Structures are given as structure tokens and as C-alpha cells.
Design a protein around this ligand. Structure first.
Ligand SMILES: Nc1ncnc2c1ncn2[C@@H]1O[C@H](COP(=O)(O)OP(=O)(O)O)[C@@H](O)[C@H]1O
Ligand SMILES: Nc1ncnc2c1ncn2[C@@H]1O[C@H](COP(=O)(O)OP(=O)(O)O)[C@@H](O)[C@H]1O
Lengths: 242, 242
């Protein structure tokens, strides 16, 4: 039975929810006519519709996430989730733009090197972590003023092994000083190794969950992996509220 | 993760239909494919007929054939707990060896989020979104007696497409025109994935890679499948020490 009750989530797992993001009918429309026109560019709700209820809900979520990051003395924020299809791309990109709009210098990173498609909203991480590219080539300017971006890059055959290396942590330390926040869209926590990976990013970590998509045991499994790996799991983000 | 195959059959009453060694030649061929700016994956069963892994797969091929005719079903499904287990490698090599045994085989890449099987040679996504007819989606490969449906272009709604009425209707017809329909299904990450695999209505096998899975991760995958009503015949233990 898919979980839709946010109160049930907070009490069952001691997971404070940093935001309730409604299912945007305007986002569904934008998605529909981009998939109809054969668009290779996903729209950014935050840039196109500043008054949308999901966007106002995202503005709230952003301030709360900033405070959490500052309390934890971090410069990296990590979004994860139990599975794909939960709105982790939508959230990470809209959050990055709102942080950039607030006045912050933001670095967005697509760390899902098996299915990351954050480039669609605008070499990448796979090359940088393979030493096929230097940092100054991987870091790209975005249409959005103040937002810089590192795509997932060419799909590698060893994405897990690349994220387990010394290089990612060491790049993140420098990038955390050159940018106000480093926002990472990480791969979903399917297994122990996924949790270890997210631990190495060492940022304020938020578990994305979509309404009606997860069973109680499914949420429990993701939380237990993150928590047993020693990840800084600040709280959750509940997405697609009807 | 778990290395001992005896612990797997004992702990989950999951009889292993095959033990497939880590093939050193496959490792070499992947390295060689990687370094060369190549857009194709080498089929081991084609290139190395007496590779120990290919030899273990002919044993597996026969066991699955007995399974599917006892079940009076010409749909075979492979699933797994996560990516990186060798499900692509096993399905394509099992498809080729079944063709070599003199069967008309249809291989379907149902994993529409990654869709890699076409690298070994319109697809499923265009078929289930009514953009293509079955006639245009089914392709004849360079392997004689082997036909193939690719993943197709990555859709925004993969689970929605696999949960549509079209999938089982198409499989009903294709099962009458081929001796074997072999499906590379998405991994069983949640009950929704187990339902989709249940609608495929085939003799189903759980792929597990040596040293990758905890006892809990294996248990979750099996539980999702058994509770969704899936005909889980047994498992395939891949990457064992040669
Ligand atoms: N709150 C929402 N309102 C409307 N559409 C949404 C919402 N959240 C996600 N979506 C849509 O659902 C789909 C899946 O979201 P996405 O971020 O791509 O998933 P993933 O978690 O795999 O990154 C996309 O088409 C996205 O635009
Ligand atoms: N038994 C094996 N011996 C050697 N290499 C293997 C074996 N099984 C899989 N591989 C390799 O491991 C990688 C991952 O396997 P693949 O089938 O692509 O994973 P997935 O489960 O995500 O489909 C590939 O490069 C594949 O060729």
C-alpha cells in the first residue's frame, strides 16, 4: 500500500519533512507539450512560473535546507531517494535555480552516472572522476545567472567504483569554498554501497519520497541503509501531493 | 555481499539454475571495448564458444528450457535486485545460445531507463506509447534465429508504459509466433516493479552477483516477487570465482 500520509512518515521513522511539494498541473502540462514537440530540453518551473504553488512550496523548502546545511557546518547538500521516478531531478534543478535567484553562487552536480539527465534542463563527472577531463572543463555555466553545473558525463562501465575513489571528496572540499552551496543529485539508495557513496559526499542529506509510491518497509530500508552508513540524514522531502 | 551459493538456496529456498563464473576474457573484451571509441558490446557466446562462462550458460539454457515447457509458457523473464549484476550479459548470451540450439528467439529489453541491449547488435517505449507498430519495433539481428525489440528512446513514464494494457497483449501474440520470448526486465526495486514483472507472466529467474548483495537485499527482492504472484522458478548466481 503506497504511503500518502505525511504525518505517518514523520512519526513512523522520526523523519522530519522539510517540505510538502504539491503535484503541479502546470508542470504536467509543460512536460506533456515538451514530450509532444520532441523537445530535448525539460522546462524549469521556477523560471517560467514564479507564482506556481510547487514553486512557492520550493522557496520554503530551500530556506529550511540552507539553515540545516549551515547548522551542520557543511557546504554540500545531497538529495537521494529509494528509487527513480520520485521527482529527484525536478526538485534538485528547481531548488538550484531558487538558491541562485536568492543571490547564492550554486554548483549543481548530476552524480547519477547510470540515468542522470540533469543536462536536459540546460564532459561531466564520469570523465573528471576517470581523469579524462580537468575540473575547469567539467564545470559549466548555465542559462541561470549564478548557477554552475557538472553533468553526469558519458555513461561509464564502473559508476559505483568512480564514486568510491579519493577524487570526488577532494574535489568537493575545494568546490565548497568557491560556491555558497554544492547541490548533488545522487543515485538512489538501493544497496549498502549506494549508502557508502552518499556518506563519502559528506553533505546535509535529504531523502526524497513521492506520495503513493513507497510502502512502509521500502522507506524503512532506505533510511536504515543511510543511517547505518553514518550519512547526515537531516530529513525528508515529500513530493507530488495531490 | 554473499559469496556462498549454498547459503542462498538454504536461506530463501531458491534453487540456483546456474553458476556462471567471472570470465577473464569478458573482462579483457570490455577493457578493449572501453579504450577503443566503440559503440558495440562483444557477445561472448559468439566470440568464445568454449569460454568457461559460455560453457556454464549452455547448462543454464537447457535447465530454463525444461522449466518453461513444464510451465507451458514460452515467456522467460530475468530480473535482479539492482543494476551492475550482469543481467544484460546473461540475457544476450542466453538469447544467442538458445538461437544456436535451433529455436526462434525474441529478446526484449524491458529496462527502458538504461536500455543497453542494443549495443550488442524504434523499440519498446515507442511500441507501448502507440508511436510504432509491432512490425516496425521487431528487428532481425546478426544472430540467425534471434529477433530483438530494443528499449527504444527513454520515455518520461517507463513504469506507466509497462503497467499499460498493451504489454501483456503484445506478449500474448509474440508468444505464439516465437519458441522463446526472453525479457530483460527492470530490477525489482519496489512492489510496483514486482507487479510489472507479474504482468509479464513468464518463468522468472532472479540474477544475483557474487559478493554484491547482503542477505537482507536478496530477501527483499524475493519477497517483492513472491507476494506479487510471480512464478519465481529460481536464481542465477553470476560472477563466481573461476
Ligand atoms: N511535483 C511534481 N509535479 C509535477 N510533475 C512532477 C513533480 N515531481 C516530479 N514530476 C515529474 O515526474 C517525472 C519524474 O521526475 P524526475 O525528477 O525525472 O524523477 P527522478 O526521481 O527519476 O529524477 C518528470 O516528468 C517530472 O517532471
Ligand atoms: N560473469 C561475468 N564475467 C565477466 N564480466 C561480466 C560477467 N557478468 C557481467 N560482466 C560484466 O559486468 C558489467 C556489468 O554487467 P551488465 O550485464 O552490463 O549489468 P546489468 O546487471 O546492469 O545489466 C558488464 O561490463 C558485463 O560485461
Amino acid at each position: 500500500q503506497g504511503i500518502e500520509d505525511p504525518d505517518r512518515i514523520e512519526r513512523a521513522f522520526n523523519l522530519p519533512l522539510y517540505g510538502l511539494v504539491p503535484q503541479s498541473a502546470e508542470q504536467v502540462k509543460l512536460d506533456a507539450q515538451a514530450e509532444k514537440s520532441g523537445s530535448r530540453t525539460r522546462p524549469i518551473l521556477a523560471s517560467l512560473r514564479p507564482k506556481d504553488l510547487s514553486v512557492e512550496s520550493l522557496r520554503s523548502l530551500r530556506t529550511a535546507m540552507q539553515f540545516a546545511m549551515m547548522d551542520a557546518k557543511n557546504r554540500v547538500i545531497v538529495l537521494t531517494g529509494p528509487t527513480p521516478g520520485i521527482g529527484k531531478s525536478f526538485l534538485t534543478v528547481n531548488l538550484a535555480v531558487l538558491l541562485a535567484h536568492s543571490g547564492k553562487r550554486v554548483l549543481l552536480i548530476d552524480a547519477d552516472m547510470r540515468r542522470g539527465l540533469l543536462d536536459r534542463y540546460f564532459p561531466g563527472l564520469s570523465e573528471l572522476l576517470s581523469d579524462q577531463s580537468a575540473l575547469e572543463d567539467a564545470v559549466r555555466e548555465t542559462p541561470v545567472q549564478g548557477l554552475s553545473f557538472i553533468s553526469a558525463g558519458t555513461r561509464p562501465p564502473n559508476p559505483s567504483e568512480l564514486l568510491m575513489s579519493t577524487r570526488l571528496p577532494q574535489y568537493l572540499e575545494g568546490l565548497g569554498k568557491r560556491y555558497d552551496v554544492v547541490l548533488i543529485d545522487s543515485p538512489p539508495v538501493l544497496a549498502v554501497t549506494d549508502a557508502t557513496i552518499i556518506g563519502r559526499m559528506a553533505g546535509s542529506t535529504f531523502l526524497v519520497l513521492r506520495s503513493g509510491m513507497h510502502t512502509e518497509g521500502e522507506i524503512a530500508d532506505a533510511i536504515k541503509r543511510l543511517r547505518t552508513a553514518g550519512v547526515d540524514l537531516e530529513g525528508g522531502i515529500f513530493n507530488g501531493v495531490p
